[PDB]
């Protein structure tokens, strides 16, 4: 877990730009599969 904290800090998701529900995530995962 030495690099895990640095990995936690590193991720540049601060620009979301998404703009529903986790059920939609499940059905879309099934569609992708």
């Amino acid at each position: 877990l030495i690099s895990e904290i640095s990995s936690k800090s590193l991720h540049n998701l601060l620009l979301s730009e998404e703009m529903r529900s986790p059920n939609v995530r499940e059905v879309l995962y099934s569609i992708l599969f």
Partner: peptide
């Protein structure tokens, strides 16, 4: 932490690419 069960497809791609980048940086020094 913001667990991975709420992220996007390209954000999960970012996670796996950072994992493989750390692995490559660890192994390239040989």
């Amino acid at each position: 932490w913001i667990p991975m069960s709420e992220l996007s497809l390209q954000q999960q791609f970012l996670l796996v690419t950072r994992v493989v980048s750390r692995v490559f940086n660890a192994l390239r020094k040989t």
